[model samples]
Target: MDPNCSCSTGGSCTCTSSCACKNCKCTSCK
Candidate 1:
């Protein structure tokens, strides 16, 4: 799991920790 993932704040992101990535479904990025 990428607790500090660099996923862009898109609808399909999975690292919602007040980061650039939100809407996390609790899954790793592809």
Candidate 2:
């Protein structure tokens, strides 16, 4: 999980659970 619009190994997102970005595919998608 990355920071809102950032990128990380297994951190946390600000908007959703994982992330909603295209580049970042750690966990969540949309």
Candidate 3:
């Protein structure tokens, strides 16, 4: 991620998650 990126504004940013469990779910977008 870039410190000067616009996503840093308005309290919005991109995040990633790595899961290895048998049950996992993602309910968000970048």
Candidate 4:
């Protein structure tokens, strides 16, 4: 699990947005 990723579940999600398990709207808008 990459620590750089902002994913709560801990994945390859490296987005600048606040990613939560329940809600991952994303700031990158992806």
Candidate 5:
């Protein structure tokens, strides 16, 4: 996965609700 995932914080990792641990259903993001 992206180390700087935009799913949670804000980075270049383009993640969305469809993302698993990178965005939506993840505790780090969700």
Candidate 6:
């Protein structure tokens, strides 16, 4: 199982989220 996630933000103070899943695992960010 494996999982990965990343996020980025720019301008006027914004929010970002990301998620990924592989093999039998999952990941998320907010």
Best of the candidates, TM-score: 5
Which residue pairs collide in model 5, if any? Answer: none
TM-scores of the models, in the given order? 0.19, 0.17, 0.16, 0.15, 0.21, 0.16
Q: After superposition, how far is residue 25 of candidate 6 from its true place, in Å?
A: 32
lDDT of 1 by residue, 1-30 (tens): 557435455556334345454333454532
lDDT of each: 0.46, 0.48, 0.35, 0.47, 0.46, 0.33
lDDT of 4: 0.47
- Clashing pairs for model 6 are none
lDDT of candidate 3 over 1-30, digit per residue (tens)? 433223223643334565332332223432
- Runs in model 2 with CA error above 4 Å? 1-17, 24-30
Q: Which 10 consecutive positions of candidate 4 have the poorest summed lDDT?
A: 2-11
Better by lDDT, candidate 5 or 4: 4
Alpha-carbon runs more than 4 Å astray in model 3: 1-16, 24-30
Native-to-model Cα distance after best TM-score fit, residue 11 in candidate 3, in Å? 28
The predicted structure with the larger TM-score, 2 or 6, is 2
Error of 6 at 27 (Å): 22
Residue 21 accuracy (lDDT) in model 1: 49
Better of 1 and 2 by TM-score: 1
Q: Which stretches of candidate 5 lie over 4 Å from their true place?
A: 1-11, 22-30
Q: Candidate 5 at 14: error in angstroms?
A: 0.2
How many clashing pairs in candidate 1?
Answer: 0
Model with the higher lDDT, candidate 3 or 4: 4
